[model samples]
Target chain A: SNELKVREFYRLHNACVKLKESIKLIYENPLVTDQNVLNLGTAENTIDYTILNTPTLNVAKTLLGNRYSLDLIDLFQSHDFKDSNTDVDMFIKYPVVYDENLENLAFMHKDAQKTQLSNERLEFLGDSWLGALVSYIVYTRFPSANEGMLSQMKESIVNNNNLFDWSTKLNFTKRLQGNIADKMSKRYADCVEAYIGALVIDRFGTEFLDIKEWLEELSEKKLAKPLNKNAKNELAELLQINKLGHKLHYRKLTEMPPFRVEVKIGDILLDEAEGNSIREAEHRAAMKVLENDELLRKYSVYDL
Target chain B: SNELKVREFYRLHNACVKLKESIKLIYENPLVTDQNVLNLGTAENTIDYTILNTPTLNVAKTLLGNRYSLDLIDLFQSHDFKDSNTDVDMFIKYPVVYDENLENLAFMHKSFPAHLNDAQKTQLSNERLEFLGDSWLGALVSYIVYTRFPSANEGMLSQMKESIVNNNNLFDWSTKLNFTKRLQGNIATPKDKMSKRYADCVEAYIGALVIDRFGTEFLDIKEWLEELSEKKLAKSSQM
Candidate 1:
């Protein structure tokens, strides 16, 4: 394994070195100097959209590198949106959906592997924006909260269940164009994130008022209740506090929601429950055992 | 007899329920309505800075509650600078450093806590700003790399980002910009300090600058950072 890691690192180092050399060549090549147009060779169609508004490339064009000619241009081939209707279709109606094909690609699931235009990249971009927005929101809202509390609150708010709730409310799955395995809460949440990514790109990352407003409204509603507790965590802590053995186990009975989940300790089933998401089902099962003191006490040896 | 465990759980559950009840009553109180000014009681002076730009409180101020009078506001008593220099001292000379006190706080190292006065200790160190700054700078870098290197995959771009913002390069930049001299703390020795402390100061400055400029200086920040990254990569290829 160490040998494999070394080989991988060596390959990456050499590749990065090569990439830097190529970039240097691009900077000094006569194609950029003498106003000769460099033919994209094979990458023009796929990459045109990516380089459209690139400030670095555009500046080169301004200095007369605007013509097209043949050149050896295959050095960089790297791993690499929507529409429609009505009041329930908020994301689809965004102006970005019409003007940019990126919006259509935003809903493309990696599972399909049908095209290079999957939402994986958009999801990554959206995650960063989502984190920044959450940080700002929590930083301002709870003025008296410490960094630890703020971090916990941010984690609670940014979790998959919360995002899945948002996706359900916003009908993200309705417009999502993915040939996914099934009705997946994570997939829907990922789509919501991808949509936000598309919005940020459309707005050039300046305006986040729309996303902020949605988050504010949702968070306010949720914060009105007790900060959500992971029932599994609560159960684990409950058992540990009682000096019980670390014998907790979880078993899945279904792949889809209403996912059937069974909670146990070694071989003894404590409870079984179903929920719209597997995690929710697991939590419900945990909660069931938590509330049933006798079931937990039955498993205990020191019942004094 | 396991009595302590049961008692502890029972007490915690009861106290949490009571706390939730109090919170509910606070939410529904007349102090939030009828245009009443709820005095912050003993907390006004200490927490005013924290609550000044708070959007939640500002909106509450909009709905007939624009004034502050006496109220039992102690339930939320929770765990809660600047100078100028010449052009050569670029960070200290920023418009933010001159105009806002936050830039001064950006240089206050946690290690220097012992020497600070009461008021200085209250303002604390650069860690919080450093945390916020790290996010913004990371996002900005991601945006730049994503746009500029269109052909690079996310993994490659990640590697590029790691190369650019690694503590080694950031410390190099911090030293180049003379951030070390401006740092107002008894920093650890070089062997113990590592590159992270110097890198953190740069990030803190960025956060303070972002807050001061209201996010409009992103272009300047991008140019400043991107140029350095290009130079760094250029040197690496030469080796």
Candidate 2:
């Protein structure tokens, strides 16, 4: 039932359309107009379509790895032909120049040099969609975490600095077209988003799931360990290495009224804790001590 | 000669009325409600009272230092009288407090506190009169410079007009009334810059004069021109 699922494809299609409409609304609003430099007419017409076959598809495969499906790519390139005159000037009107190396894909910007059909619009739409998709993924994954923690993680990953690092690591920057010598230019990042949007549009279905799987794998590799529940145990191991030979003992100083403990570092009173047992109390006390002192605050090793 | 003398007083009285009317218009316009805070009601509960003591009196000794003739001190104190013993009680109820400390005495708010009597109505009429008087003062100063400083052109006349007609200059001129000592209003401490309401009232009074006497007689067009010019010139020379 799931193999040839039309329902999932429609859902992803609807999601893309809704995202596109939202971006259109944001662009049209007067207040947002003041913030963004919107180039609508001439600049939008220079999109390089040939990049779709080479750099865009290659990056998709690399990012998604084995989870990638060629189903969407097959559907995108498939064209139906009916009866037509063979003597017509088809080659002169619509030239299909093929190159083995991806270098010629960078020069495809010259072919689509007309106004109003450029890759920039695709890029703007793609950037907004990617941001929304990332936000959705992060929010759902870390439901118990506070907004600030989630924001800090998202900022570290999705921000320009991180995006540039990711792009360079994948050699995606080297594959950029049309005056992309500088890494700092907004156009470079925009092309990345535009290519993603164009892929989603062409493939249109389970291809999005392929993208989602790729993003999840990337997140797990970079972010999951530091952000996981066993962060405290990891922190304890690090503290043992740093505080070697120091007499740092956690003890249950009081238990008359409740399961509570007080930790003392030499003569200095450090922390008090309440837990189910004396061992639990001592562990709680250690955590409490770590929480209070600035130098010892990061002893938990958790993602902030 | 007797007809001419009667006509002269009539002209002066009308000039004063006209000045009062002009200021009243400005007071009514919401845009200049800030200026309305400066109005201080006058003697006879009307804004048309003569600024000088006697119409015919010309000598500085007879006109200038004679306090009892017009009783500017009494008029200033009357601004504070709240008791309904006389018609002037209406003025005490009408609080015209101006804050000179603010950038430009920008009005925060205004409320007419007085229960209007017929005499109070006559006095309140001066608000519009004051607005006209402001224009009259500007024109008069410009005209005076134009005629007296014959060698100077329009630019010099404009400069002189600007110096004489400015609120700071008018405030200084009105201060000659010993405004701090004479002012009677709701404020307990009237000496502070916050209570420089008398300065605005002086302009309204001038407005009353222009309206009542048609600018010629009640204003003492020649003497006022001479005195204001001399004072201005003296201040400039000192600078």
Candidate 3:
């Protein structure tokens, strides 16, 4: 029973600490604040109230094994004055202004309103950092590739869809706050981006090997499982080899509201389908056509 | 040797007959009449006299065999008298004028000074006939193509017509007629050499053909023109 409670608390506490750490990293650069909050006139004191509170630090201690030291001055300098003013008002209303140190007060009074501290700014910075990191990884991993090929591989890895998928696998929904965020919105998608931004700000640059290690660990824990199915790639490979005496044409008939694909073999219509994208429609249509011939078993490796 | 000579003469006669036939076929209607004569004033008398005296029928027989026929009535009727009258004097000076009737006093006046005649007009005669022939040949060719090539559209027909009956084709046809050999002139150069006069006679032949065969009941004008065109095209393509 103690193990079960410890596991449950640890899970919840881990989520909270990760979120707080992400926020603290974003506020680590005292002089060099996030441009968005700075432009909104709230760079001076937003982080103190929302992220530097005792509850948030306790959660961080629980998750980080109590090894992490809180840096109040750096957190104070990271926030915009407008956010700090809002934080001051929030602290007054809540009456939970904890530390009296000027740096602490400043951090406590920084942007506390969720609207004032949207993750969009952090997400943007994080996306750029992630792109750079992914590019570097792809480049080093695929040394045989020319620059162009490496770039394309990096692009594929860092694409929005790929990032969103990775974020989903990470259970980012558990860490995100908005009420509607859990149902949809891919709030975790933006959280991952914000985390990267926090990492960059906290380290003053992207050279922190520890941050990279953390990302690798997170990726292993979240996304180590194999994909659900390999049916489509198998089908494509099978179709490539089947020697038939018919001309095949995959025509993109229309693409306005939705994509429609028409597959024809000679004059014979093989399949047609509509999808949100051309690739999806073609896949569906190909699958439909394959079903009639019962060739899926022949193509599938596990069929035997 | 005498038999050989006679055969040669016969060949020459046949050649002449063919030339005359071609000329008549091309210029089906000759516009030389009283109205043209009247417009030309007293100078018109020279043309009428020249037409009456010219050995057109004999030349036609020699060139086109006995199959050739002269149509002075039709020729005289087609002429604008007022127009002819203005240029009758100059017309009389021409070296060749063909007519069926063969009776005009001005032509009978053999005593008229030959040197007084315009040598340019006399040698290179049939200019008016040549003008008419060019247009007539074009019309005949187009008409034939329209009726025969029913499935051929206008563009195809036009291309075929242009290829067969363009000025180059006409020049080649003139060479075939031996117009250079038969052309009556006093040029210093040989007849075989290229000359404007030779080309002019070729056009005159075309005008005569249009007048003779265009609307005749016995002759299927379309078929005749097409056959001639085919022959011409055959020769042209070889060249």
Candidate 4:
């Protein structure tokens, strides 16, 4: 039965997620830099300083530097979203208004003009525009990072959850049009994107500098906070990595606030923790086990 | 045990790679877009247009446009790489020479300078440089296609971009331009004449050349790409 297929996929996905750290390590390995393994050790010491000061490196640095307007333009080409999702049929699927210059701009800037775009249309364009914008910010802000690392960071910052948070914090809830009390967050999120879409139309894709500055200031708080929040997931990943996933279980001891939760391996109890909610309590329990070095080493089948 | 561990890792990695498409679908599923399934079917039509043209939407659209200097500045903050590698203590690990502007540029632009940046210290590796340049070359080529074939949708544009910028084309161009002659590395054995490194070197060179020219060289670069791409694209289309 196809019931097995979904299960298989889940199993594979779970296994992959379990090996996430190892996969990340492989990508991060500097040994994967270039195929020329012959030059790995010898070339580093032998390659003279004079060779380092070449025109190419000089030019590369200047172009990369926050030197001038050209540097910013270089920034645009890097974070362009079309590169990331090339298969997404852009011109046909989305309405793209390309302008040479926006000297007599803001004609589209006004709301009382031509037929207003569908929110889906605005959302789509905004999604790409905001994606490009966020991508550019992420790329420049982390200059030395490799592509894999940059992609993860970009995804973290650009997600709808983060967008929803920003929307809520910035009073987009009051400004929004949704059901939708339960749907308010996403509605606000879409609102944020549509705003970006309309912004693009108004400015004709210029004024990127001010938009960047505004966004930088806006996202500064979000950027400062670390992304990892799911302790339960981390514990699950750790257990899965050790092939102890099937052995693990979480048991609720109390139903009330300061809800007590116990995490365990079969009948063997690890520890207990308390939180306002059962989920929180479980997360706390998992976090407690994770934090306990002795517990980690004791249960872990492999290197912790 | 060590062998088993290695085997296990490979197994996991292989499974991941195999399920790559599935994982991507999971991420891309519009059903995954918002948490509220309650609003999914009901919210679309009822949302109304007056709400769409709100001040927030207006501001966002204006902000994201290609109109003023601010738009380009917006481009800068997005591509910042620090957010990607927070653990890789950027301040200490990398030697960053942060400058406000390049007003009296070319002081460091000149080869003779106060302590030159190491090739590794180029704030990017050759591979990384190649990657950036590849994006740049793609963009330039895409713009060329965009303007040249104004009517063509994304599919044709993509095909045209591929025709102009693929490894074979790049390798051909680089070889014709003698970019392979300029490369320096320690290879014990002779490499394939059409090895990707040649194309990579070409990309890196394009990146370096563009950077060195400080964006002024795009016209020249565009002209070169245009001539080469037009010839290649035309020939390929006929075939």
Candidate 5:
């Protein structure tokens, strides 16, 4: 019942349609900063916990004013896209310019090659940052679980299917400079990931955490705790319990490049399945046996 | 011209010490749990809002009821270091069972090697916490840098953070705080060459601090870092 079972193979991928839809003017406004670099809010006013806070670390704030750079004069702004999906508050709108060094958004710069300057770097950082965020959450959730188990759980937590669903749910795809082409990518997973990358560059960690939590909840079904997917192992173990020394053996059959495998017990053929590889054949054969356990129970020497 | 040659060096280094020390420890009380996790407030709760808040995710407050497994039952307490340094409302803390799975506090669990005996590892020289803190520090410092010099673009912001977190510079700060005294690691070697290690441990301490420091909100911590950054560190020679 599970074979590709036919000659002509075709199905809807939906990506091309989704990609073509993204081909619009993608003017993303960046969250911005001034190159002026001010001192810790005039340190002369002396410590008052009530009027303002962090007086103790205001010195650290003063260090934030570490002064002077060549790129400070040029502005890092220009509008290329239209009908923005973003709130005006989310981005910095300013006079755009062309140059190498100055206080500028990486997104605003063109490379020595021609890669448009962008948060491409932040995406790399955010990729790992988001990974840690997911890992830490997984760590906390399954405290008693081994690191391997936790890692498994984390892998299950983020994936294209999940993020694509998440992006669609949050209108992330819409807000995206929708296009399969340049200024955008076809992968919706990157949409959510890049959005997070932007947030990391533009917002603080706590804020990032809040948004991550929101997405996790909204995407919770996909984010659900993973189950042990060792059905093949389970079937093998189940066989061990039923017999004295008989082991199941698998033999492969063929199709036009597709595969078919048979599961047997000491010359007794239990089932056969068609799959793309031996693993799939074995897995499907095992699945078939498990699914038809009632038949194995009533007529066979071995009980399922 | 004696200390003056390195005075600015000494001064900035000194400033770094005061800056790091100015990173106050707001001791947070941890959120504790017992064996057999089966609920949100139960199995997985303590992780801070910075990673993801538990309450909001608790839409299935009852969802955590998916219970089973003895190994999974080990306790992972919530950590809120204390009511020190700054007054922040949001924090989670619980008793630490270091022997238990790091699931409780990956930050704390990372501090020591498991091969070491409990007595030997009490001072937990944390690395994971330090790793996490490095990013947290980046975020915190970014907020500070952004707010302090609201106009500075990306390059200067990166430059500012690098200048603040380096080993040689941090060594100056650690020297001022008598940082070595607090650490449970062995004492040895020249102060000149070890600035890097000392500086790194300083980041770890802050990493540990971040557990509690990631309070209800971050502006409190950001403001604090700024003030600390501005404060001058007295020269170590005077001590």
Candidate 6:
């Protein structure tokens, strides 16, 4: 794999070299020269209303591949988008969905071969903007809080289940398309995120004041709590004060497709849990241990 | 429209001054410059020895975007300011072509390149800085575009943003500021018009300068961006 990447790197480097060489040929070429350069950009009529929503990916690919035409390479982006829209009544893609790369974020569910738009792509964009929003709120809301505390607060605010609650409250499920439209699950939370992606892209570019107002209104009006998150790290901090060093451990005892993991503290068997991955099982094991402690137990999501 | 960056200055001011002196040490030793004088009003330590490229500035000051934790303390202690050493985590792209054109610096920003190990490529490449600078410029532009065109739809708003942030606009900015006129990178081609790397270079310059003024709030660039917006998008909306 390293060797392949090295070769790929060299290929990428060589492509740049080739590009420079070819450009030199064009300027010195007989046919291309003696042309007065006009405007750097032009208008297109491929779409009456809707556009592809991204140029860096859509426009560049066409021109970059065809080097023979100078017009295609620079200042000549043809419209590759067809006129289309999801005419869903009572739904708006603006003020929340502002992702430039929304098309890529779409996930294909139902039929694996069905390559139509999905919520996967927009979910990531939604997640990122959400995190950015949370970071801004944490930094401003708690002036005295340290960065760690700020991050902790942000996690509490933007945590997955909290958004799930928002998704349920807002009824974000009907928004999804593709495979998810066939069968609905916890994907509703993600659809909420996709709505966020749509709203953010539209909202962030058109009106940020709108975003600030929305967040303040939403935060104050609808008080949604974070998902059932185990206070593993917080509990560890509590234990660290008594002993500067703590030998807490979460190790896998058996690998049965889904691994069986066990947690320990000074020869005390806290609990064991099973998970598809080690990190998950370990996190659950920590959650189990926290339930036994009175102070940290209050923060545990075990009851949920 | 950094013609307006609300910087009321950043990390690069001291580093730029330091760089001028270092170059003074070169280009035939301008024996009148100071070498070891400490530059004040900075993030303190690690960054003192750190490189002030767009990535260095963005990664240093960036709070959102990715959850990157590039260690400044270790980067400072390990990196030699004067040495020709390079991080294996870097890519040495030439004029750093993106979007299949000669000047899509945002492509470099969106691009995620990774090296296998302690890799070393060519020096003086702005690939990494261009990427980081794009984010600062991007986040800066995101808010600006939002406020500027209060009524424009998503398509129109993005079109306005695309017009300004593209290679053509940035390339012109670079030429206006003489960033393109001065070049130390490899020039394998005489066809200089396609050498539109200057546009993003200006973006990087402003991106670096933001820290010198408002830390990293990006509000610093809003005032200056209004000037850019006035010319680029402000007129279209008046109708």
Candidate 5 lDDT over residue span B177-233, tens digit each: 576664444555435545656666555554444443232122322232222222121
Off by over 4 Å in 1: A1-100, A111-116, A177-183, A205-304, B1-98, B111-122, B184-190, B215-239
Alpha-carbon shift of residue A95 in model 5 (angstroms): 31
Error of 3 at A226 (Å): 60
The lDDT per prediction is 0.47, 0.35, 0.37, 0.41, 0.37, 0.36
Specify the CAPRI tier of model 3.
Answer: incorrect
Location of the lowest summed lDDT over 10 successive residues in candidate 4 chain A: A82-91
TM-score of each: 0.41, 0.20, 0.19, 0.28, 0.31, 0.25
Q: Which ten residues in a row have the lowest lDDT in candidate 1 chain A?
A: A77-86
True contacts kept of each: 0.04, 0.00, 0.00, 0.00, 0.01, 0.00
What's the i-RMS of each model?
Answer: 29.9, 44.6, 55.1, 21.0, 24.6, 25.1
Error of 6 at A51 (Å): 50
Please write out the lDDT profile of model 2 over residues A1-304, one tens digit for every residue: 1211122222222222222222232223321233323221223222212212222222222222322332222221232111111121122221111111212322223122231244443443344444433433333344433334444544554556555554564456566634655445455555555544443333222212222232233223222221223423533554543432344455665666478776654444567777666766666766765556563543323333
**What is the C-alpha lDDT profile of model 3 across B1-239, one tens digit per residue?**
22222222222222222222233432331222223322322332344343222233123223223222433223223332121122212312221222211111111111222334343332233443454454444433443343345455445556665665555655665565465555444654533335444555555654333332222111221222223224322332211
How does model 5 score by TM-score?
0.31
> By lDDT, who's the top model here?
1
Per-residue C-alpha lDDT of model 2 across residues B37-102, encoded as one tens digit per residue:
323222343221221121111111221233354332243234442111222222232212211222
Range of the 10 consecutive residues with the lowest summed lDDT in candidate 6 chain A: A81-90
lDDT of 2: 0.35
Q: Could you tell which candidate, 4 or 5, scores higher by TM-score?
A: 5
Q: Report residue A150 deviation for candidate 3 (angstroms).
A: 82
RMSD of 2: 42.3
lDDT tens digits by residue: candidate 6, B97-206:
11122232222322223453211211123343343345445444544444444444445445655665667766655655455444544654353545455655655443
Residue A185, candidate 4: Cα error in Å is 14
- lDDT string for model 5 (A1-304, tens) is 0111000000000111111111110011010012312122335443222112432223222323321321101111111111112122122222111121211332232232332244344334344445545544433333344444544554554555655665565565554442453223325565455444444443232323322332233223322321224756867666644443566678888854589989877677789878777778778877888778674564345543
lDDT of 2 at A203: 28
Across A46-138, the per-residue lDDT of candidate 3 in tens digits comes to 432222222222222232331234232222233221111221122122112111221121111112243224544445445545554443333
Specify the highest-TM-score model's number: 1
